[PDB]
Every structure is written in structure tokens, then in C-alpha cells.
């Protein structure tokens, strides 16, 4: 629809809010203009959620434990506090890994101190020390322990840094304290930042004096790919077929040794800028490692990123890049020839957390599909600066959208497909709009690379053209 129609729709959606909430939410909605380079004059992000408005955002514990630290497989992560936060995040995110779950990998397990009233009143530092002792006794093959603080830890005056230092010195083990209490920040973004700082301060600087790792000129690290359904592996296979050596993966299927070996690489390949830009900038400052953002969503973005990455190395890498592109051209061309006719001209509305609302636009456009509305839960204004050019003109932009706002926008816009999280999935399925989970890939995937593009196109076709969407109205009504 026209730009003026979008502004009118925004105004009539905001009419029902109280004056303060409406005034706040008016700053978080925008009509896109790709010619604008600064989003601070177009949209406001990374702010408080209005109380009692059904925000989708999570907490800092979700951004630290659930996003950055949890995927690291050889480490044991203690949800420090009451049982709830660890129980609700157990195996809820599909950060795939290879290992033996009771023995040397612990991603899908729930370790928690299970705080009670006595621990709230008298503190849980002694309980934390005893817990670390028991973790050492019962899981001897763990290569490190992280302590992710839940809300009460930051409020009862618990000193987990001192316990971590004492027990780590005593057991000669890495113990990383993370003050990732849920009330800190406004969303999972501050959790990302706190987890990046913890990585920098407790893990990253472990082998600075160590020079026993042989470094090749083609050493790269993958930063900010969490292997959702195997996305990191699908990116790594393409990167290694290009002649590159992927030393580290952050943090999907990641190990603590890979994090400790990252300062030795030649290039950092940052997939999720939002969650790992802090550590990327720290590594560039301290070790002089350049970092670059890349997109492996869809064949066009994949090819562009592969060429951009190969342009950072010698001519042999460029030749191998061209060979990989030529090798994979028939596969994605066949995927397009099969699925683009079934998807051409269909409109999409997206609302994912901090990277994907702009990263997956090219994969949609490669199947003839247009994105008419996008938004973020916890993105910053640099994310919207990157998003505005990737969006078309007069497309809706929403930051920290509320349930009512998103439902009203979908009702007016009427997209052919919605890509969002599990808390919107069944809401929009009941309204008759095909829905794709853009966090967990609807328990499918990967979506990165050419294999991921094949899977993604098949999934979009299987959901958008599903017969069940033509049976919502009873024939007698």
C-alpha cells in the first residue's frame, strides 16, 4: 500500500493506547525509506518496553545463557538462582552440536542451584561453591563452568565473582561468572553484551602467551553463528571448500578451546552483528584481527558474501571461491526453478529478534517474494541503519512491537506469510495466515548456504501453499 496509508494505519493502531504508551510507541513505528541512512531520525529502538503490553522480548539471562554461553558444548552452565529460568530455557533453542551429553557435552542439560527461601535470605555463595565441587565430582570431563546469574542473584548481594575466582584457582578450572540478571537491560541485547564481556574477560585471553598453535594465512573464525538446525555447519562447509580454515565457531557447536584459539585467526566472519559485535571489536582492537559481516541466507547473498570473503585473501582463495560458486550454481538454480513459480509475488511480514529481520530478506527475494513489513525485538539503531536499505519503499518497520500492534498490522496489511516466534505462531495460524517460525526454523533447517536455501524454499512452499489454509471457513458459513 501507499506510504500515507501506512502512516494512517499506524495512527489508528496507536489511537487505542493511553497517552504515555501511545506517545512512546509512536517513536517505535516507521514507514521505510531506503534513501535514509540514519534510523535515529526515523525510528527509535533499544528502549524500555511499555508495561503490560505483551512484548515479545526476553531477558538478559536469555541473551547470555540461552544465546551466547549455552551453545558452548564442553562447558557446564549453571543457571544460578530459582529453578524456573533454567527449566524454561532447557533445550528450547536448536543450537546443534556433536558430543556425548552426559559426559563431554552438556548443551541440552539443565544445571541449576535451585534457590530456596534459605538461599534467598542467607545468600547462595556457599551453595555455589558446593555446587561447583559436585559438578567437578559428577562431570569430570567438563572443560569449564559458567555461572549465569538469574534475577535474585543481582538483588540479594551475592558475590559470584569471588566464588568463581577462588574455586577456579583451587580446581585449576575456568569458572566464568556472568551477571546476566533478567532485570538488567531491556531485552536479550544486554545479555549479549554481558556475555561478550564475560568471554573477553575470562576465556578469550587464555593463550596470549601460548604460541604452540600453527597458523595458516587462511585462518578465519565464525562469530555469531549459533548452528540453529545446523546453520553453522552449512556455512563452514562452504568456507572450507573455498580453501579457508575455520579455527573457531561462536558459539554453536563451539568449544572453549575454539574460543581460546580465535585470537590466532586472520579474519573474523561475523554473522550476527547484534550479538557479537562487541567481541569482534575487542579482538580487532587487541589482536588486530579484521572482522567483516557476511550473509549466507539465499544464493545471491551467499555468493556476494563468498566473493567478499575471498577478496580478503590471495588469488588462490578467489579461484576456489569461483569454483565453489560454479559447483553450487546448478543446485540453487534448480531449487529456484522448482519453487519460485509457487512463491512469486507473495508478501511476507517478519518479526524476529536482532539479526534475521534483515538478514533473510534476500533469501525471500530470491524466490520472487517481497517483504512488506519487518521489525525487531531488541535491535539497536545500527541494525535499523542496515535494515532500511534492505527494505523496499513504504514498508512497515516496527521495533519492540506489541501483540495488539502486530495483530492489527497483520489484519490491515494481510500478508501471505508471517515469519516470527512461537508466541505469535498460533495467534497468526488461527487468523488463517501461513506462519513460519524464524527462530527455530519450525524444527527444520538449516537455512544457511545453498543446502539451507533448498531447505528454506521447500519449507516456504510447504507452508504457504498448504491445503489447510483453504479450510478455515466452514462451508455452511
Amino acid at each position: 500500500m501507499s506510504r500515507e496509508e501506512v502512516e494512517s494505519l499506524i495512527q489508528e493502531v496507536l489511537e487505542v493506547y493511553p497517552e504515555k504508551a501511545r506517545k512512546d510507541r509512536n517513536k517505535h513505528l516507521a514507514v521505510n525509506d531506503p534513501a535514509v541512512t540514519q534510523s535515529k531520525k526515523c525510528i527509535i529502538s533499544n528502549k524500555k518496553s511499555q508495561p503490560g503490553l505483551m512484548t515479545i522480548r526476553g531477558c538478559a539471562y536469555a541473551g547470555s545463557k540461552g544465546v551466547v554461553w549455552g551453545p558452548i558444548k564442553d562447558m557446564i552452565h549453571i543457571s544460578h538462582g530459582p529453578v524456573g529460568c533454567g527449566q524454561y530455557s532447557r533445550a528450547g533453542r536448536r543450537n546443534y552440536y556433536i558430543g556425548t551429553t552426559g559426559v563431554n557435552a552438556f548443551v541440552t542439560m539443565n544445571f541449576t542451584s535451585d534457590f530456596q527461601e534459605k538461599d534467598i535470605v542467607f545468600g547462595g555463595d556457599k551453595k555455589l561453591a558446593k555446587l561447583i565441587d559436585e559438578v567437578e565430582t559428577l562431570f569430570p570431563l567438563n572443560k569449564g563452568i559458567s555461572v549465569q546469574s538469574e534475577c535474585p542473584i543481582g538483588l540479594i548481594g551475592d558475590d559470584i565473582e569471588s566464588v568463581s575466582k577462588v574455586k577456579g584457582a583451587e580446581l585449576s578450572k575456568t569458572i566464568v561468572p556472568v551477571r546476566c540478571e533478567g532485570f538488567r537491560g531491556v531485552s536479550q541485547s544486554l545479555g549479549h553484551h554481558i556475555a561478550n564481556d564475560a568471554v573477553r574477560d575470562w576465556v578469550l585471553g587464555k593463550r596470549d602467551e601460548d604460541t604452540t598453535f600453527a597458523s595458516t594465512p587462511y585462518d578465519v573464525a565464525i562469530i555469531g553463528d549459533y548452528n540453529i538446525g545446523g546453520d553453522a555447519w552449512s556455512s563452514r562447509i562452504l568456507l572450507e571448500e573455498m580453501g579457508l580454515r575455520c579455527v573457531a565457531q561462536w558459539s554453536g557447536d563451539g568449544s572453549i578451546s575454539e574460543i581460546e584459539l580465535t585470537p590466532k585467526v586472520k579474519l573474523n566472519l561475523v554473522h550476527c552483528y547484534r550479538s557479537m559485535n562487541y567481541i569482534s571489536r575487542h579482538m580487532e582492537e587487541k589482536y588486530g584481527i579484521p572482522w567483516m559481516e557476511y550473509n549466507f541466507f539465499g544464493p545471491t547473498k551467499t555468493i556476494e558474501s563468498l566473493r567478499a570473503i575471498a577478496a580478503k585473501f590471495d588469488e588462490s582463495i578467489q579461484k576456489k571461491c569461483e569454483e565453489v560458486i560454479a559447483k553450487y550454481k546448478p543446485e540453487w538454480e534448480a531449487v529456484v526453478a522448482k519453487y519460485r513459480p509457487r512463491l512469486e509475488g507473495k508478501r511476507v511480514m517478519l518479526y524476529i529478534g536482532g539479526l534475521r529481520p534483515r538478514h533473510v530478506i534476500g533469501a525471500y527475494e530470491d524466490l520472487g517474494m517481497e517483504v512488506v513489513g519487518t521489525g525487531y525485538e531488541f535491535a539497536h539503531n545500527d541494525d535499523y541503519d542496515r535494515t532500511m536499505k534492505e527494505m523496499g519503499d513504504s514498508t512497515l518497520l516496527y521495533d519492540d512491537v506489541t501483540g495488539y500492534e502486530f495483530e492489527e498490522f497483520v489484519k490491515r496489511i494481510k500478508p501471505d506469510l508471517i515469519g516470527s516466534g512461537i508466541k505469535e505462531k498460533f495467534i497468526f495460524q488461527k487468523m488463517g495466515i501461513p506462519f513460519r517460525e524464524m527462530h527455530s526454523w519450525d524444527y527444520s533447517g538449516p537455512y544457511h548456504g545453498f543446502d539451507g536455501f533448498a531447505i528454506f524454499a521447500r519449507d516456504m512452499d510447504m507452508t504457504l501453499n498448504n491445503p489447510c489454509w483453504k479450510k478455515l471457513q466452514a462451508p455452511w458459513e
Binding site: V16, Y17, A21, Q50, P51, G52, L53, M54, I56, C59, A62, D74, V83, G84, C85, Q87, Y88, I98, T100, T101, N104, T108, M109, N110, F111, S113, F115, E117, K130, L131, E134, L138, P140, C151, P152, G182, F183, G229, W233, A248, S255, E258, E331, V335, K338, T402, Y404, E407, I422, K423, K425, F426, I427, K430, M431, S444, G445, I455, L472, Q473
Partner: protein, 522 residues
């Protein structure tokens, strides 16, 4: 590589040779992985008695718990009421997690709001958060009622829910007559079922405490039914059906079955069904109140007996045969309505099913876990079926409940090899199923990993999981099942006997090796 006509998702795409080689390169080059012999040795050690002793000496570490926190149960109870918004005072991350948990279990939309208390409220309290949240929620989602629970942050800080709600009403953020019942639901006390109890008691007291003068017990000729924390819609439906069959007037207080089963017809309904405020107000006028799950409705029981003056009967959960019989006889005695021929016929059909299947069910050994009332009902039914519940785990159980379950076990010869565990998590249960192997496990989806672990030791040590309880994430539409009444007993019996028969078929499918017992007729 992908074939356009045979596109492969992660399994078995990553089983391809190039992916296997890339993964092996990653493992050998940079992971610094422990040797496979060391990993195998440590796993074998974790399956042993010495590891079980070390595991059961745990005091400060909890691994894979089998419980959640109070505000989840409070949110469920609040969802049980008509056009009621669950409202959790505290941090928004908890509400996101509650909504995701219930969305994955029920595969349905779940409405709940948070007032988004942040660090600015860490020292100043969340009064302004409460006012703005109540106003915004009422303006936006137009609920008839807002039911307030707490996150652990608000409990630790010490926010006064009553004073905050009163100040919100006093300064015009919400109308003074708008119903805002509240309950303190600290995540560090009890579990989610305790939160259900607290929320229900808060709502019942909100609607009845100051209006008891004109209340006469048994003036509406109805029986109150408090279901407790319940995640099977079939259980609500079966209780309502059995009470309607008897011709017994009833009020199901906190009935969320409608809002958790909304039809897909091109329109999203945030609210559907639920206990009306008139029902809650008239609840003291009932003949009696029956608590379906007494072991986590103690606060509600105290309020109902002390304020409504209802002689709440001592009834177990209506699970299995005998306890359903006792529930029906108590309902008949309270309401004066005889048990109809349809319920007697249904009981006879359940007994027929038990006689049809007793040969395959006899002597089978089960390790089971879940909430206290559900666990003890399942144990009672298993004892009725001639089965052996060897490992009975209840993470949120207590000593009195353990004593009751021990009394139940001692009354039957099939409970002689049974041990009850309270305060133990699923790592303890994994040790138990490795050391004293049962035939089957009964529990929620978190048990699947235990099965994987057992299968890693060998096919002969694998303990298959039967998904009865909460939450079930890896199977679809199991929340529509029933576990209460004769209907629930039939469903449970069918599931158990057919799991046994499916396991036997899998074990005897080997041609020329075990297929001599691959009987067509069982």
C-alpha cells in the same frame, strides 16, 4: 549438496560424507576433544552404582529438574477465568518463558502480560510499573479481570501487591470496581503447582472474603470443583461430562479448557470460556467444594474450609478405578444424586479392558515422575493393573505426600519393590534406571534424553519413555488426552499395554533371530 527432488533437512543432510569429513576435521583440529576411549569410560562409570552413590550425595547441585516455578501455575490458573488477563509483576523475561512453555505444550496462543520491571525498579520498587501496566493492559486488551502474580525479582525486592493495586485504583489508572485479584508467587518457594494454589486462593479470597454475610452453604444446590494445575483438556472435559451425567450441579472454578482449545476459523480469540466472576462470587453458596488435586491445593483448602465453611471431603485425585469410584460416591453423597447406569457401564468397560490386558500388564516395572497428585494417582492405577512402580520420583513432593504414597504402596503386594523419591531430579532418575532398570519410564518429554542415555549403553539396557504428564513437547496434540476418571484410566491402560506390545514387536522383529515370537495375535 542437495537434490532438488529429495531435499534433506539437518538429519540426514549432516550424515553425508563431506559433512562428516568437515566435522571430523573440526573435532581433530580445534576442539581438543577428549579421546573416545576416555568418553566411553566416563559414560560407563556414570551408569554404575558408585556414580549413583555420588549422585545421591548431592546437596547443592540440581541437574535436569522435574518442576517449574510458581508464576507458571499462577498464569495457568488466571487463564482459567473468563476474559482474564494473567499479569506478572516483575521482569518480562519470565513472561516470555511462561508463554513459550505453554505455547509449546498446548500448541495454542497463551496470553500473559508483564509490567517489565527493570534495574530502575530494583531499588525504587515497581509501583509505577504496576500502575502503567494495569492501565495499558486494560486499555489495550480489554480484559474483564486482571490476575496478578509475581516474578522472583518482585518477591525479593519486596513489592506490596495489595498496596500497589490500591494506589493504582486510587489515582485513576484503573477503575476502583475493576477486579484485580493478586497473589505472591515466589519462584524460590514450592513449584508451579504452588503458584496455581496461590493464584486460586488469591482470586477466591478477592471475590468472597468481604461478602460472606449473605452466604448460605448449599443454597445454589451445586458442588464446587477446583481442578488445580492441569494441562490435559480431556481432564476438564471428563470431569464436566461425569458430573453432567449424574445430573449434578457443579461450578468448575478456573476452567481454562475453552481458551486452550480455540478453533482455527480465521479469527483469533484472546479469551474464550472460563469461570465467570458470578460463579466465583456464588461459590460460597455451594453445597461443598471438591479439590481434584489436594496435595497442591492446601492453601485453597484452608481458605475454603475456614471462610466458606465447606466440609471439603478427603478425596484422592479421581485417577484409576478405586479413586474414581470414591470420587463418584462422594459426589453422589454430597449432591444426593445417584450414580447413573452410564457411569456403571463405563466402569464395567474399564474393568473389561483391565481383564483383557492384565496378562501383558502383569509384573511390568515402571519408573515414573511428575507432580504429586498425578504421580500418586498413576502409582495407584499401576498397582491396580498389577504393575510395579519401582522408581517413584516427585521433585516437588514433600514428606507427608511421600508418607501417603508409601502407605498406598504398602497396601498392595505390587508396591513391595517400590521406592519414593522427593527432592530428586531427572539425573537421579537416570542413575536409578541405569542401576535398577525398569521396563518403562512414565513422564514428560525431558525423559527422552534418559532413554537416549540408556540406548547408548545398549539396546538391552534401553528404557522406553511413555509420555504422560507435563510438559510434552516432542509429540503433537497429547494435551487433548484424558487421565482422570474411567475414560482417563482407559486411555492410560491403552497407552501402557500398547507401549509394551510395540516394544515386544520391536524386540522380536529380527528375521530368523527373534521373529519366532513375532506373533500376529497378542
Amino acid at each position: 549438496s542437495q537434490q532438488v527432488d529429495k531435499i534433506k533437512a539437518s538429519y540426514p543432510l549432516f550424515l553425508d560424507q563431506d559433512y562428516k569429513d568437515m566435522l571430523a576435521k573440526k573435532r581433530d583440529g580445534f576442539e581438543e576433544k577428549y579421546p573416545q576411549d576416555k568418553i566411553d569410560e566416563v559414560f560407563q562409570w556414570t551408569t554404575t552404582k558408585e556414580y549413583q552413590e555420588l549422585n545421591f550425595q548431592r546437596e547443592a547441585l540440581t541437574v535436569n529438574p522435574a518442576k517449574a516455578c510458581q508464576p507458571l501455575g499462577a498464569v495457568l490458573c488466571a487463564l482459567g477465568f473468563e476474559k482474564t488477563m494473567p499479569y506478572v509483576h516483575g521482569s518480562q523475561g519470565c513472561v516470555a518463558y511462561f508463554r513459550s512453555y505453554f505455547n509449546r505444550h498446548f500448541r495454542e496462543p497463551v496470553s500473559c502480560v508483564s509490567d517489565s520491571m527493570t534495574e530502575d525498579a530494583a531499588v525504587f520498587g515497581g509501583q509505577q510499573n504496576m500502575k502503567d501496566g494495569l492501565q495499558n493492559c486494560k486499555a489495550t486488551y480489554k480484559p474483564d479481570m486482571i490476575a496478578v502474580s509475581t516474578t522472583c525479582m518482585a518477591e525479593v525486592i519486596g513489592d506490596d501487591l495489595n498496596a500497589f493495586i490500591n494506589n493504582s485504583k486510587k489515582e485513576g489508572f484503573i477503575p476502583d470496581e475493576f477486579p484485580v485479584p493478586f497473589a505472591h508467587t515466589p519462584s524460590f518457594v514450592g513449584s508451579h503447582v504452588t503458584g496455581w494454589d496461590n493464584m486460586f486462593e488469591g482470586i477466591a479470597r478477592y471475590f468472597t472474603l468481604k461478602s460472606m454475610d449473605d452466604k448460605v452453604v448449599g443454597s445454589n444446590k451445586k458442588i464446587n470443583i477446583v481442578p488445580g494445575f492441569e494441562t490435559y483438556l480431556g481432564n476438564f472435559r471428563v470431569i464436566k461430562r461425569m458430573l453432567s451425567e449424574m445430573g449434578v450441579g457443579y461450578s468448575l472454578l478456573s476452567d481454562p479448557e475453552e481458551v486452550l482449545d480455540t478453533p482455527a476459523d480465521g479469527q483469533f480469540r484472546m479469551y474464550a470460556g472460563g469461570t465467570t466472576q458470578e460463579e466465583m462470587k456464588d461459590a460460597p453458596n455451594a453445597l461443598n467444594t471438591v479439590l481434584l488435586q489436594p496435595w497442591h491445593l492446601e492453601k485453597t483448602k484452608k481458605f475454603v474450609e475456614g471462610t466458606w465453611k465447606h466440609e471439603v471431603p478427603k478425596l484422592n485425585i479421581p485417577m484409576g478405578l478405586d479413586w474414581t469410584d470414591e470420587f463418584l460416591m462422594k459426589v453422589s453423597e454430597i449432591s444426593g444424586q445417584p450414580i447413573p447406569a452410564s457411569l456403571t457401564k463405563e466402569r464395567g468397560r474399564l474393568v473389561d479392558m483391565m481383564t483383557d490386558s492384565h496378562t501383558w500388564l502383569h509384573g511390568k516395572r515402571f519408573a515414573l515422575w511428575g507432580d504429586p497428585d498425578f504421580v500418586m494417582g498413576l502409582v495407584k492405577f499401576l498397582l491396580e493393573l498389577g504393575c510395579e512402580p519401582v522408581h517413584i520420583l516427585c521433585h516437588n513432593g514433600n514428606k507427608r505426600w511421600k508418607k501417603a504414597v508409601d502407605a498406598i504402596l504398602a497396601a498392595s503386594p505390587y508396591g513391595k519393590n517400590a521406592t519414593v523419591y522427593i527432592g530428586k531430579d531427572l539425573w537421579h532418575l537416570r542413575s536409578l534406571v541405569f542401576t535398577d532398570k525398569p521396563d518403562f519410564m512414565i513422564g514428560n518429554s525431558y525423559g527422552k534424553f534418559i532413554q537416549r542415555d540408556t540406548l547408548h549403553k545398549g539396546k538391552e539396557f534401553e528404557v522406553p519413555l511413555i509420555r504422560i504428564g507435563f510438559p510434552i513437547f516432542d509429540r503433537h496434540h497429547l494435551h487433548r488426552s484424558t487421565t482422570l476418571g474411567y475414560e482417563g484410566a482407559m486411555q492410560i491402560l491403552t497407552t501402557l499395554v500398547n507401549s509394551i506390545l510395540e516394544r515386544l514387536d520391536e524386540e522380536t522383529r529380527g528375521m530368523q533371530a527373534t521373529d519366532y515370537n513375532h506373533d500376529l495375535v497378542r
